[PDB]
Design a protein around this ligand. Structure first.
Ligand SMILES: [Cl-]
Ligand SMILES: [Cl-]
Lengths: 409, 411
């Protein structure tokens, strides 16, 4: 509630102030102890996450947790985040680190535990406080993830309230935490929009990813490549390919190949029963569900061993086509293109859905289409451009400190 | 002619197309536009300065001449050779799109120059939203840069502006689908409005100085005043108050009369406060006015030759004392500290009052007091920290006006 939010915030403020003065050695001891404990809990937390949210796959969520813990630990074990980062005694200058203070972490339904572990460990490493604003749908997964890391932290010497959370999440409390004066940064992983509209320094962490397969591509490789992501944690991953935009001459060959990967191409009529279930705004009930259960939410009989649903668009890429949108599930759109340039044009449109200009992909004969690649590179407004490569082929400590420069006469 | 919504939208579309064409330009073509437009802007150094002072009613013509110079020639020499287009697996620089420049009355011509130049250098389009008290000199500095870019071959609508600025349109420009970035300078309000726009936004603080007992007082006093009269103290990140340790307080205060800095009586100080802030905000009518004029509007008598007003705090730095605020004028608060740590503590509040901490300074004996320097370093939540040096993130540049894109190939 509104009142007890303030009291919890002022606790972590003072706890951060105590934390700020710590030695790198105590920071390191806490970091390792918090990370080793999160890793050792990879399975229990993954299991808890699956059951509460009611989506995804334990074994894949176990992998997610191991990455957010041991992998983060090994990347930043030796990264300097405190004190003098640079000196030049001749110029009489130096750069000094400064923790940002208190972080506000927005955690989604989609990766409740791994994102909490990740943000917790990188806050601890940088002498920050962090407060989690979980999604109702996975409140306990993330807060118990936060708690496990807290308790391991407190036991290696960390201040009592260096991490907290909103126990019962609301729109009032999320907005209270965000616009609060002593919260310095938003780490936000639509909900992106709220963070950027709050007056705060914000880092937003998804986006719509199109894939163009042109006439010169290796069809068998492109098709397997594009499919790699869709089944991992039931397609719950941020950078992933949402639709295939295929040049006419190679269209049918792409469509036929899907079937040897257990990707079921939905008839026109069965695609419309899925398309009415994907969107209403993305429907939370399909998010991170297997292809077979999404089909059974729709009207659609699909073979038992199917891993992915393919819904092909009549007409071009259109806002009205839900298969043209980000689906967070084992689903892909498939859209027909007159030629390479047309497919590029259709990709541009998918990118505009999302506002987020994240990543795009092209499958083509590299050896002979250098012009096309450069063309593709000049026309995609996405930070990452992938050629013949899937998205499964970056917030860090450095973002949660301030560099202060000191100049002496 | 942009005085309303259908006209703003219509103008935005013309810049959209201009930027589309400009995106295609070569680095050579860009260089030529960049040189030509910077040279023209510099050549209009004086007439644009004069226009600025006349219209906004503030500042010093020949100080704004220097501002217009540094926004033009200096910006040119800094970035003549900087790569902004093309190749940098591979990295491709690309223009952000259309920029929204928010231009304040304090620097109406130099910021429109600067912003236009680095926008041109990056193949972006830019549309300015001036403040109504300086709208002509802002839009005409814009026009002059535009005309010279166009004559050097830049697309027609590449720079735009709102002819009759208003809240609804300013808000609309920032919120418009087709604006990629907001470059917002000026007031705490506007800057924060750019941060709440839900768009990528760059904003262009209240600067405390501590003078402890170990300092060189002659030097500290002199250095602290250097910024104060430049364009009547409209100077980004110049000193706003001295916080002085009690042991050397009368010494510092005594040296102020030597430098044309009049120390206000407790009574006069009170009169000046009420004129400094109005409705909690910096009073527009004192900004960029000389010390004597600010004395006149407060109804306070001051020698004809005085350059800076000094208002002494009664007690410690506090939100309630207008001299603890950013004043954008030749005026300085002066506050008493019991000792060095108490000084640092009052400086901390001044950084809080300013909002975002940006710069702070300490004068000490740096060849004895290393512990104090480090101590001041730790407590000061400011990007820049200066020891024994006047103020006289980093700077906004082309770097900020492009998105970098990585292409990854498959072996
Ligand atoms: Cl997870
Ligand atoms: Cl100016």
């Amino acid at each position: 509630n509104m009142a007890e939010l303030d009291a919890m915030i002022a606790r972590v403020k003072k706890a951060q102030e105590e934390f700020a003065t710590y030695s790198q050695e105590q920071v390191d001891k806490i970091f390792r102890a918090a990370s080793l404990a999160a890793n050792q809990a990879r399975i229990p937390l993954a299991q808890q996450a699956v059951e509460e949210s009611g989506m995804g796959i334990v074994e894949d969520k176990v992998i997610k947790n191991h990455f957010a813990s041991e992998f983060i630990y090994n990347k930043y074990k030796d990264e300097q985040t405190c004190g003098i980062l640079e000196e030049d005694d001749n110029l009489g200058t130096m750069t000094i680190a400064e923790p940002v203070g208190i972080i506000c972490g927005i955690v989604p339904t989609t990766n409740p535990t791994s994102t909490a572990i990740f943000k917790s460990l990188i806050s601890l490493k940088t002498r920050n406080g962090i407060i989690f604003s979980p999604h109702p749908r996975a409140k306990n997964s993330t807060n118990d993830a936060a708690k496990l890391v807290l308790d391991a932290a407190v036991a290696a010497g960390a201040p009592k309230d260096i991490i907290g959370w909103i126990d019962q999440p609301s729109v009032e409390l999320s907005n209270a935490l965000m616009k609060h004066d002593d919260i310095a940064l938003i780490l936000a992983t639509g909900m992106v929009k709220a963070a950027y509209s709050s007056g705060k320094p914000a880092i937003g962490v998804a986006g719509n990813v199109p894939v163009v397969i042109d006439e010169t591509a290796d069809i068998k490789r492109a098709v397997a490549s594009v499919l790699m992501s869709k089944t991992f944690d039931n397609g719950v991953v941020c950078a992933s390919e949402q639709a295939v935009i295929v040049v006419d001459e190679v269209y049918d060959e792409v469509k036929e190949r899907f079937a040897s990967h257990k990707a079921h191409v939905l008839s026109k009529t069965d695609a419309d029963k899925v398309r009415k279930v994907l969107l209403i705004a993305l429907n939370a009930k399909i998010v991170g569900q297997p292809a077979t259960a999404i089909a059974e939410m729709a009207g659609v009989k699909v073979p038992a061993d199917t891993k992915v649903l393919i819904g092909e668009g009549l007409g071009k890429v259109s806002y009205d086509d839900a298969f043209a949108h980000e689906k967070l599930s084992p689903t892909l759109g498939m859209f027909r293109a007159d030629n390479f340039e047309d497919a590029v044009a259709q990709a541009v449109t998918m990118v505009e859905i999302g506002g987020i200009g994240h990543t795009s992909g092209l499958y083509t004969n590299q050896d002979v289409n250098a012009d096309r690649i450069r063309y593709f590179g000049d026309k995609m407004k996405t930070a990452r451009i992938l050629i013949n490569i899937p998205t499964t082929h970056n917030v860090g400590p450095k973002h949660l400190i301030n560099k202060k420069t000191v100049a002496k006469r």
